Nucleic acid binder design. Structure first.
Lengths: 114, 215, 120, 48, 122
RNA sequence: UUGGCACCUCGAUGUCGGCUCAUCGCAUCCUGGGGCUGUAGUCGGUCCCAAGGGUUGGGCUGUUCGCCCAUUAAAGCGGUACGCGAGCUGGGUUCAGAACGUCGUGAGACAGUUCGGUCCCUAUCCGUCGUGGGCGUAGGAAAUUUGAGAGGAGCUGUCCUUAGUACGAGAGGACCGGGAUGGACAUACCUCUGGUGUACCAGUUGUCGUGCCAACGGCAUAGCUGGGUAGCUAUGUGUGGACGGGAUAAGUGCUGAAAGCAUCUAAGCAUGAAGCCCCCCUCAAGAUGAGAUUUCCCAACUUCGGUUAUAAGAUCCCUCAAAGAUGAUGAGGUUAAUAGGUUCGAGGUGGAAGCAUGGUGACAUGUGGAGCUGACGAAUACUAAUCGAUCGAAGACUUAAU
């Protein structure tokens, strides 16, 4: 049996806690950062640009503008360094990959709700 | 010590301590048996040989390789065994273990062993000099007609021949190659797999030779 | 898939005109590589005929050329009507197949392996 | 570009020793007819 | 990927607005740079006044490439422009008013003064 | 190197640089080991041993050269028709045009400038890079191997500890060790990041067509545009150089005469380097010396000349791809899951048509993560891997033990 082995071996490391989202949705990713001091948690609020190929290598990407400078950030979906994902706001998009927002700044990069 | 045969299933990833992503090659090291024990008193060197994947028995009008032939029946009958598709010797192991007929299972390795994995390459076919070797190509403009040729192949008339080792085009090829000092990260006993850290040579459903590190 | 020595549109136009004529006459004589490739075309097009709904009527007309069969008693059905009406009624129990390839000798002008592809 | 020397009659005949041709399939058609090419359906003078 | 002759925005008030790289220092043959790599560079667009002026050759650290860095947990980070902070050859900056987000990956390169003079580090 | 000579070539030995690909010397540029020092340390200087590996990117000049900006452990010097144009460019220059300076009465000339100015060749042989066939290897096969040999690899920085210790008046600042990491390079692989992805999905312009509406179809670079699986891929992931043994170089010695001494040498005995031989990685019995192990197969006719058949085993042929120009290689060939189809997925696209509702409309919403989906996964004999045919051993002597 070839076909189960990619699945049945990496199955016990995939997660179940995570909510359901899609591109266009605003997220509050609660990533935890461990320096030599403690296990601090920093929140990254952005808009989902990309969700690609499945398995334990499911990977999403959110986009934030910090100080006038847009910031892409890409996570493995099943990594154990995301403590929480909140879906803040839904989004009315008609693509699966929202790469056009990279050239849109200000109010032109606006995504509706629901 | 600790040789085993398997085949490449594919490639995944695993998270570890402090959430570190580590790439992983799943190797299904299934149904390996010790098939002939070789001795210096008979051959000149000490090794076992392990047969990997069992195939169907002798059939009279067999036209392909998945039915064993009569030399491979009687060879895998001197051990109480089924005939195997792949058979490899391992001489780094200790010959005083491994009674002939032992199912050498997947739990000979523990998570954290350093290993060497031996396999063939993919095989790319007839390739040119800047692909088969890492050669700089010529300029694509400015009048030039030299792009993906090899360059000069010699000096003029001292050395009125081309030296061998010239690095000319030809078959890129699936040839055997070892990647050294890989880790075992996870041994699933019930699925009979090994997750080795990184990538091993060969295509999928190939053949690997996981043996422990000589370094 | 095979490229058949043609462009992406020359192959596409060749392959749906070769699949239409295997609905009209139900057995055609082509070369071997052109029958290996129209095999998967017309078998995916009888699969649309066994459905018979309007949504796959629109999909079988993606492929089929507008060819009119002169049937018996001077009645004329199109190749779209003949696909959902006659071939779809023959293979409503069979779960695949629908064609066979019978090899023949080389041609005279080429060493092209002649092939009859039939509709079973 | 050009041959510096002519090839002999001996060297020419050593080159074209693999310039040959094979005998074909030649299986009998058990229903009727002469020998058909193997794995092929007959067209003329046979019942395959 | 930042090589020779890349224009970078300058991300503080050191006196420069744009800068182009001469060499990526490090080793011999070193072609590209990312966050945490020090580059030697000439300013092309300079603010009237300040410290550095147009045609000075300065050393400077990369903050926020457009092709950003990968982290040990398989995480990534990317930015919308290439930026840069002119430093003062002890891994300490020239300015006090570093602009824009700074990647986390230069905390471990002893650029703690650049982190403390910056906005939110991600 | 500039020359000298005029020996080879004028029924042609065709071009300075640059590019691509190198290769070889060592009079060593970096790294290794030493001696001496007007060597405190840190740095040096000089000499010796050593070719293993490494030896940057720009600006100006057609430039070789040279200068310069940056770096670097270092930016070695030479040879190979001032290596390499039937491998590439043609900026430089001996072509015809034209112009200046200069010279000449002049036509012109300069070896002074300046602008412009056609780079031919289907590889016969050798040689090289891959790949088959034949035969041999004293029976024939199948499989695993030995390694005689050959090849590849071989570089190095920074930081932290030792230790602010030794040293030094201070300033400064170690060896030896330990550890961390890099750069460059070489590999393997597509999990991630990306790229491509012309039989995938969607949007959209023009025009023609399917009677019309609606839906589609053709062409317009794939009409454009937004994505994207498989596969191939790096700039993406992984590893690698290491150690460690022998023998040595320069050197350093111990014992020790010759020569009562002294003496590293003569007899001895040590020690000593990125070098040498292994160690490491490949490839290798055509290694004609043709190796070894395991398993399988065993004929008669018959001047045994040979034939007839065949064994084990293969092959033709056919379905194929993890393989491939071809052929080889591998998976299969009905007792069959080999490929296609079908069914179910995975991933991709992002909400099909039709219908309903709302809006005057363009359009929205519902039906509904909907439809569709090339290479990916599983199941399934539905279709096709038909019947067949060809090849294939009979074990030589000699002597020695038994």
């Amino acid at each position: 049996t070839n076909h189960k082995l990619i699945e049945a071996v990496t199955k016990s490391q995939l997660r179940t806690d995570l909510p359901s989202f899609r591109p266009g949705d605003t997220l509050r990713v609660h990533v935890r950062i461990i320096e030599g001091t403690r296990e601090r948690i920093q929140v990254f609020e952005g808009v989902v640009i990309k969700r690609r190929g499945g398995g334990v290598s499911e990977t999403f990407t959110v986009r934030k503008i910090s100080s006038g400078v847009g910031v892409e950030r890409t996570f493995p979906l099943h990594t154990p360094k995301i403590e929480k994902i909140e879906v803040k706001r839904r989004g009315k998009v008609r693509r699966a990959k929202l790469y056009y927002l990279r050239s849109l700044r200000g109010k032109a990069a606006r995504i509706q709700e629901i | 010590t600790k040789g085993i045969l398997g085949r490449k299933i594919g490639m995944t990833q695993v998270f570890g301590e402090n959430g570190e992503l580590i790439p992983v090659t799943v190797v299904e090291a299934k149904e390996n048996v010790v098939l002939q024990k070789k001795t210096v008193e008979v051959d000149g060197y000490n090794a076992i040989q392990v047969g990997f994947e069992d195939k169907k028995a002798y059939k009279k009008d067999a036209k392909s390789n998945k039915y064993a032939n009569k030399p491979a029946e009687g060879h895998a009958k001197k051990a109480d065994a089924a005939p195997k598709r792949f058979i490899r010797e391992f001489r780094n192991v200790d010959v005083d273990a491994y009674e002939v007929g032992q199912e050498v299972s997947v739990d000979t390795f523990v998570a954290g062993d350093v290993i060497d994995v031996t396999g063939v390459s993919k095989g790319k076919g007839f390739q040119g000099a800047i692909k088969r070797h890492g050669q700089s190509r010529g300029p694509m403009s400015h009048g030039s007609h030299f792009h993906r040729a090899p360059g000069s192949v010699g000096m003029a008339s001292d050395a009125s021949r081309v030296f061998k080792g010239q690095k000319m085009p030809g078959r890129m090829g699936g040839n055997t190659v070892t990647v050294q000092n890989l880790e075992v990260v996870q041994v699933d006993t019930e699925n009979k797999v090994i997750l080795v850290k990184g990538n091993v040579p060969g295509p999928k459903k190939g053949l690997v030779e996981i043996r422990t590190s000589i370094k | 898939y095979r490229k058949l020595g043609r462009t992406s549109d020359q192959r596409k136009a060749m392959l749906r005109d070769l699949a239409t004529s295997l609905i009209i006459s139900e057995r055609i004589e082509t070369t071997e590589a052109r029958a290996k490739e129209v095999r998967s075309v017309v078998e995916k097009l009888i699969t649309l005929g066994k459905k018979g709904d309007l949504a796959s009527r629109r999909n079988a007309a993606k492929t089929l050329r507008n060819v009119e069969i002169l049937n018996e008693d001077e009645t004329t059905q199109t190749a779209l009507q003949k696909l959902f009406g006659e071939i779809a009624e023959r293979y409503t129990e069979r779960q695949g197949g629908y064609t066979r390839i019978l090899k023949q000798g080389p041609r005279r002008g080429d060493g092209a392996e002649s092939v009859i592809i039939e509709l079973v | 570009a050009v041959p510096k020397r002519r090839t002999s009659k001996t060297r020419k005949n050593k080159r074209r020793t693999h310039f040959k041709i094979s005998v074909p399939g030649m299986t009998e058609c058990p229903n009727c007819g002469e020998y058909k090419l193997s794995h092929r359906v007959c067209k003329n003078c046979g019942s395959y | 990927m930042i090589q020779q002759e890349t224009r970078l925005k300058v991300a503080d008030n050191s006196g420069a607005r744009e800068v182009l790289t001469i060499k990526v220092l490090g080793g011999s043959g070193r072609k590209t740079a990312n966050i945490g790599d020090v580059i030697v560079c000439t300013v092309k667009n300079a603010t009237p006044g300040g410290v550095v002026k147009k045609g000075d050759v300065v050393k400077a650290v990369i903050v926020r490439t457009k092709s950003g860095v990968r982290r040990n947990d398989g995480s990534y980070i990317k930015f919308d422009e290439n930026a840069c902070v002119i430093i003062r050859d002890d891994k300490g900056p020239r300015g006090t008013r570093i602009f824009g987000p700074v990647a986390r990956e230069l905390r471990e390169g002893n650029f703690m003064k650049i982190v403390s003079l910056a906005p939110e580090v991600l």
